[PDB]
Amino acid sequence: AQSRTLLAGIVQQQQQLLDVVKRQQELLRLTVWGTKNLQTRVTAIEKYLKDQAQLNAWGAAFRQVAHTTVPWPNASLTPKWNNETWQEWERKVDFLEENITALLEEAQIQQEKNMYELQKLNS
Amino acid sequence: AQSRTLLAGIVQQQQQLLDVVKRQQELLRLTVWGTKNLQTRVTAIEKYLKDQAQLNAWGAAFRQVAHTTVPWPNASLTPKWNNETWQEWERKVDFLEENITALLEEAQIQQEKNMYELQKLNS
Amino acid sequence: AQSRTLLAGIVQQQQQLLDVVKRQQELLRLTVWGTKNLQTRVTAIEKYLKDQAQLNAWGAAFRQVAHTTVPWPNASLTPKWNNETWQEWERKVDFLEENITALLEEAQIQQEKNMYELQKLNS
């Protein structure tokens, strides 16, 4: 009178949820890659912004043998506020990412055992 | 003849899935923080872009006592299309984020009860 | 002596986990939208960066009837390294996104059946 057939569905449902959760983890990494990759583009953009500051007034003088160059910063470089927080942001993802992988490894081991134990009841 | 030992594994597996799902929620917030933080950097960059437009032709005149300044916009400011949609994007995350927290609270309460009920069967 | 009441809680817990997982999927898409949307802003910014390069030295000449224009690139355009990888990044999300939707459809069908089967035991 045991409802093993129902348990087989429940145990299987956990496996499907586990697969999606695992997929979310891989997908989550991609989101981090795009967000983080954009930051690399931003650093490249900051350089170009600075190059402009170099452009100020060239040839702006026909009676003087001099050129005035005023490289006033143009890129707001983030050294402490965002860089320090960004490192924390990436670090945190690492700790949670590692936590998730650890839990997934346990879930996979445990998910298999629940299915293995079920087979024994009706092997 | 009840398979409580199997249920203990199944109930535990749900707890581990719940922990990972919860972790995804915290991790999801970090992804939103980095994406959103980049937008703040973009707003800072837009300002610098505008400063350039101010730079056009300085000292480009040695027989005139005047300076020509042409601040042609350089930053594409998003006032309606992206700003309005971005607010919706952030809002939507808020509604889904709140929905997830509400469901997690129920899941935690319910997860505990399922384990508590299991103890009673074999307390 | 069957613990159906416990199963009803376990089966329900899976439904709540499924709802949150599904919510994560919708939320995950928003994160991709913001990250990807920023890239569209970056492409707009690259154009403006180039416009600057056009600005070099105007009117920098009062004894010549000529203007020197030096449009030195200012935007680092990503044609192959990031564009090709970015397409892969978006593609991968598509494959995982489709995988998740497929699994969710099966989970919903299966989740319903587990609940439907439970009703039969005590309908």
SS in 3 state form for chain A? Answer: CCCHHHHHHHHHHHHHHHHHHHHHHHHHHHHHHHHHHHHHHHHHHHHHHHHHHHCCECCCCCCCCCCECCCCCCCCCCCCHHHHHHHHHHHHHHHHHHHHHHHHHHHHHHHHHHHHHHHHHCC
Looking up residue A69, the CATH number of its domain turns out to be: 1.10.287.210
Nearest to C5 by CA among A119, B116, A18, B104: B116
**Distance from first CA to last CA of chain B, Å, rounded?**
16
How many domains is chain B built from?
1
| φ, ψ dihedrals at C57, nearest 5° | -150, 95
Given B23, B38, B60, which is nearest A39 (Cβ)? B38
CA distance C103 to B116: 30
Restricting to B residues 55-114, those with a Cβ less than 8 Å away from any Cβ of C are: 55-57, 59-63, 68, 72, 74-76, 78, 82, 85-86, 89, 92-93, 96-97, 99-100, 103-104, 106-107, 110-111, 113-114
Which residues span the domain enclosing B107? 1-123
**Separation between Cα atoms, residue A107 and residue B21, nearest integer Å:** 12
Name the residue of chain B whose CA is nearest to A33's CA: B31
Q: Tell me the one-letter amino acid at C59.
A: G
| CA–CA min distance A45, chain C (Å) | 7
- What chain B residue is nearest to A56 in terms of C-alpha separation? B55
Contacts of C111 in chain B (CB under 8 A): none
CB atoms within 10 A of CB A89: 20
Nearest to A111 among B13, B48, B57 (CB): B13
Q: Do residues B88 and C51 make contact, with C-beta atoms less than 8 angstroms apart?
A: no
* Sequence-ordered list of residues with C-beta below 8 angstroms from that of C48, at least 6 positions apart, any chain: B49, B74, B75, B76
Give yes or no for B20 touching C (CB within 8 A).
Answer: no
Method in brief: NMR
